[PDB]
Design an enzyme around this catalytic site. Structure first.
Site, PDB file in Angstrom:
ATOM      1  N   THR A 159     -74.683  62.941 123.392  1.00  0.00           N
ATOM      2  CA  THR A 159     -73.583  63.898 123.204  1.00  0.00           C
ATOM      3  C   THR A 159     -73.908  65.266 123.821  1.00  0.00           C
ATOM      4  OG1 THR A 159     -74.478  64.407 121.032  1.00  0.00           O
ATOM      5  CG2 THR A 159     -72.665  62.843 121.122  1.00  0.00           C
ATOM      6  N   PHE A 208     -66.929  68.112 116.579  1.00  0.00           N
ATOM      7  CA  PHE A 208     -68.030  67.771 115.687  1.00  0.00           C
ATOM      8  C   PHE A 208     -67.585  67.028 114.421  1.00  0.00           C
ATOM      9  CE2 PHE A 208     -69.595  71.368 118.225  1.00  0.00           C
ATOM     10  CZ  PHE A 208     -70.755  70.783 118.738  1.00  0.00           C
ATOM     11  N   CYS A 253     -70.753  66.629 112.119  1.00  0.00           N
ATOM     12  CA  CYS A 253     -72.054  66.682 112.776  1.00  0.00           C
ATOM     13  C   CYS A 253     -73.005  67.627 112.068  1.00  0.00           C
ATOM     14  CB  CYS A 253     -71.897  67.171 114.212  1.00  0.00           C
ATOM     15  SG  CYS A 253     -73.457  67.057 115.112  1.00  0.00           S
TER      16      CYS A 253
HETATM   17  C1  HEM Z   1     -72.529  68.525 121.542  1.00  0.00           C
HETATM   18  C2  HEM Z   1     -73.256  67.558 120.964  1.00  0.00           C
HETATM   19  C3  HEM Z   1     -72.746  66.754 119.755  1.00  0.00           C
HETATM   20  C4  HEM Z   1     -71.495  66.346 119.458  1.00  0.00           C
HETATM   21  C5  HEM Z   1     -70.189  66.567 120.273  1.00  0.00           C
HETATM   22  C6  HEM Z   1     -71.556  65.618 118.213  1.00  0.00           C
HETATM   23  C7  HEM Z   1     -70.485  65.045 117.553  1.00  0.00           C
HETATM   24  C8  HEM Z   1     -70.536  64.420 116.324  1.00  0.00           C
HETATM   25  C9  HEM Z   1     -69.414  63.832 115.623  1.00  0.00           C
HETATM   26  C10 HEM Z   1     -67.959  63.799 116.158  1.00  0.00           C
HETATM   27  C11 HEM Z   1     -69.870  63.331 114.463  1.00  0.00           C
HETATM   28  C12 HEM Z   1     -69.021  62.596 113.390  1.00  0.00           C
HETATM   29  C13 HEM Z   1     -69.053  61.096 113.681  1.00  0.00           C
HETATM   30  C14 HEM Z   1     -68.142  60.285 112.791  1.00  0.00           C
HETATM   31  O1  HEM Z   1     -67.346  60.871 112.024  1.00  0.00           O
HETATM   32  O2  HEM Z   1     -68.229  59.022 112.862  1.00  0.00           O
HETATM   33  C15 HEM Z   1     -71.297  63.588 114.384  1.00  0.00           C
HETATM   34  C16 HEM Z   1     -72.143  63.250 113.341  1.00  0.00           C
HETATM   35  C17 HEM Z   1     -73.517  63.417 113.257  1.00  0.00           C
HETATM   36  N1  HEM Z   1     -74.326  64.073 114.176  1.00  0.00           N
HETATM   37 FE1  HEM Z   1     -73.600  64.911 115.987  1.00  0.00          FE
HETATM   38  N2  HEM Z   1     -72.864  65.616 117.778  1.00  0.00           N
HETATM   39  C18 HEM Z   1     -73.638  66.302 118.706  1.00  0.00           C
HETATM   40  C19 HEM Z   1     -74.999  66.546 118.659  1.00  0.00           C
HETATM   41  C20 HEM Z   1     -75.877  66.176 117.654  1.00  0.00           C
HETATM   42  C21 HEM Z   1     -77.316  66.412 117.593  1.00  0.00           C
HETATM   43  C22 HEM Z   1     -78.147  67.150 118.682  1.00  0.00           C
HETATM   44  C23 HEM Z   1     -77.765  65.867 116.439  1.00  0.00           C
HETATM   45  C24 HEM Z   1     -79.184  65.807 115.815  1.00  0.00           C
HETATM   46  C25 HEM Z   1     -80.289  66.324 116.373  1.00  0.00           C
HETATM   47  C26 HEM Z   1     -76.630  65.299 115.737  1.00  0.00           C
HETATM   48  C27 HEM Z   1     -76.695  64.638 114.526  1.00  0.00           C
HETATM   49  C28 HEM Z   1     -75.658  64.054 113.817  1.00  0.00           C
HETATM   50  C29 HEM Z   1     -75.787  63.360 112.555  1.00  0.00           C
HETATM   51  C30 HEM Z   1     -77.092  63.095 111.752  1.00  0.00           C
HETATM   52  C31 HEM Z   1     -74.367  62.936 112.192  1.00  0.00           C
HETATM   53  C32 HEM Z   1     -73.939  62.177 110.940  1.00  0.00           C
HETATM   54  C33 HEM Z   1     -73.712  63.267 109.878  1.00  0.00           C
HETATM   55  C34 HEM Z   1     -73.271  62.679 108.561  1.00  0.00           C
HETATM   56  O3  HEM Z   1     -72.312  61.869 108.575  1.00  0.00           O
HETATM   57  O4  HEM Z   1     -73.869  63.035 107.504  1.00  0.00           O
HETATM   58  N3  HEM Z   1     -75.506  65.483 116.516  1.00  0.00           N
HETATM   59  N4  HEM Z   1     -71.663  64.260 115.538  1.00  0.00           N
END
Ligand code: HEM
Length: 453
Positions: free
Chosen positions: A266, A391, A398
């Site tokens: 991402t 996010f 996120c």
């Molecule tokens: C620009 C970069 C990123 C974007 C656009 C992004 C986007 C997202 C989105 C849309 C979700 C929700 C997914 C869902 O509802 O099924 C999510 C969840 C999550 N993201 Fe990211 N993400 C990015 C970068 C990162 C990074 C660098 C990390 C960790 C080092 C991270 C860790 C997580 C985790 C652990 C979740 C699950 C959170 C939970 O449900 O408790 N993300 N992300």
């Protein structure tokens, strides 16, 4: 109200419509023709795709809808386990990991990761400084090296040393292959077909490679007693406020694999789309470069200076508006409910938020939706609630948001300070779709401004 639905193909229903390497872009086209909501059926399944802020704000009501594990996430769970990204909200390990990890992911916590982020960012800059006159940069490839190495170092103090290699570290090769396999299973008509025995064998091998490295690092750390500035140290020492329990070693491993598999792709896509939009919009690039030069006055960026890159921040938000690199998330109805006062849903009915389409809602953003205009985000608290969701939503948003943006802002700032960029091939945007989005084959030339690090 009857709900719009695209072409059906007998017992296969709508499924053939996603028989393409670019299904999200196909769905945006369908949304263009059908509007804010359409039903999508496959053999034995049904979902509804949402595109308007009006309906998405309702879907984002946590009293009414919770995160669904899509088929894509269920396949990814084969290696991401019950990490945060692939857990049901009601699984004990979700709330527990969420409680423990939140403080490790705050804006404040980014001060602790900044030095390691700079370490890898400097390696990227030096790589580009050291290219000969006739060479070019493979953008998403280098952004992926950058983000993987950064998450490795900040995640668990491990150096993949991607900038020292043509062939990636074995862990990375397995991870990319495991991700690819989970993706291919989505479009695989006959999974039991013997032509897939090797794939299955390879998938198990690649899961083992990932588990072995991460488990070894966790074990090594516990035996050494060493304390670092990384996520691993936080997870080993953290206790759930609710129970007083720490995460067990297996869940910590899943969290690490999750940060890598999801976070790297991402964030790499975001940096790639941002540079793409900058080179395609010279006036915007000029403004971003002017800020980088003005703000980044020291040999390496300070934590505080990154927050001061206000226009760079806006550039990244505008890239996320147009091509949010995790382009969809899935929700289920918690109880029987009526959506938008028009569409009855039953308990457990599944909705898909089509983010790129949401971000093109003309009622929110105006007519010029396809224009790259960072100035849209000049006052970010003025954008309506639930209009901009790169996010995700609520407690299942996120957790890595501040990490991703700190990393992307730092790196884009440094690139803009150190180089003039040339779209030497007049690159034609080709968006490859996996679990995420990226500009496939995007290349540039970077001419050094010859400013020392
Ligand atoms: C620009 C970069 C990123 C974007 C656009 C992004 C986007 C997202 C989105 C849309 C979700 C929700 C997914 C869902 O509802 O099924 C999510 C969840 C999550 N993201 Fe990211 N993400 C990015 C970068 C990162 C990074 C660098 C990390 C960790 C080092 C991270 C860790 C997580 C985790 C652990 C979740 C699950 C959170 C939970 O449900 O408790 N993300 N992300």
């Amino acid at each position: 109200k009857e709900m719009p639905q695209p072409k059906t193909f007998g017992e296969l229903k709508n499924l053939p419509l996603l028989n393409t390497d670019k299904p999200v872009q196909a769905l945006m086209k369908i949304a263009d023709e059908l509007g804010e909501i359409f039903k999508f059926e496959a053999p034995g399944r049904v979902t509804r795709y949402l595109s308007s802020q009006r309906l998405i704000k309702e879907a984002c009501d946590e009293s009414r809808f919770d995160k669904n594990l899509s088929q894509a996430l269920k396949f990814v769970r084969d290696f991401a386990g019950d990490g945060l990204f692939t857990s049901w909200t009601h699984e004990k390990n979700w709330k527990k990991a969420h409680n423990i990890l939140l403080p490790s992911f705050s804006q404040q916590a980014m001060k602790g990761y900044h030095a390691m982020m700079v370490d890898i960012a400097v390696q990227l800059v030096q790589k580009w400084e050291r290219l000969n006159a006739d060479e070019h940069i493979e953008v998403p490839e280098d952004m992926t090296r950058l983000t993987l190495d950064t998450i490795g170092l900040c995640g668990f103090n491990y150096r993949f040393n991607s900038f020292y290699r043509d062939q990636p570290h074995p862990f990375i090769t397995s991870m990319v292959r495991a991700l690819d396999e989970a993706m291919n299973k989505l479009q695989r008509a006959n999974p039991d077909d013997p032509a897939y025995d090797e794939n299955k064998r390879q998938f198990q091998e690649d899961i083992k490679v990932m588990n072995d490295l991460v488990d070894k690092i966790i074990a090594d750390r516990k035996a050494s007693g060493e304390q670092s500035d990384d996520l691993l140290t936080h997870m080993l020492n953290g206790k759930d406020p609710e129970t007083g329990e720490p995460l067990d070693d297996e869940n910590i491993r899943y969290q690490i694999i999750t940060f890598l598999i999801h976070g790297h792709e991402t964030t790499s896509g975001l940096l790639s789309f941002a540079l793409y939009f900058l080179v395609k919009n010279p006036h915007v690039l000029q403004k971003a470069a002017e800020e980088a030069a003005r703000v980044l006055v020291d040999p390496v960026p300070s934590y505080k200076q990154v927050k001061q890159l206000k226009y760079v921040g806006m550039v990244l938000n505008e890239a996320l508006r147009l091509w949010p690199t995790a382009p969809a998330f899935s929700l289920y109805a918690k109880e029987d409910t009526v959506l938008g006062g028009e569409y009855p849903l039953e308990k457990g009915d599944e909705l898909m938020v089509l983010i790129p389409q949401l971000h093109r809602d003309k009622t929110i953003w105006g007519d010029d939706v396809e224009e790259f205009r960072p100035e849209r985000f000049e006052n970010p608290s003025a954008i309506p609630q639930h209009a901009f969701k790169p996010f995700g939503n609520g407690q299942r948003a996120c957790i890595g948001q501040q990490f991703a943006l700190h990393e992307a802002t730092l790196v884009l700032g440094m690139m803009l300070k150190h180089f003039d960029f040339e779209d030497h091939t007049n690159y034609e945007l080709d968006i490859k779709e996996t679990l995420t989005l990226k500009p496939e084959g995007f290349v540039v030339k970077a001419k050094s401004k010859k400013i020392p690090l």
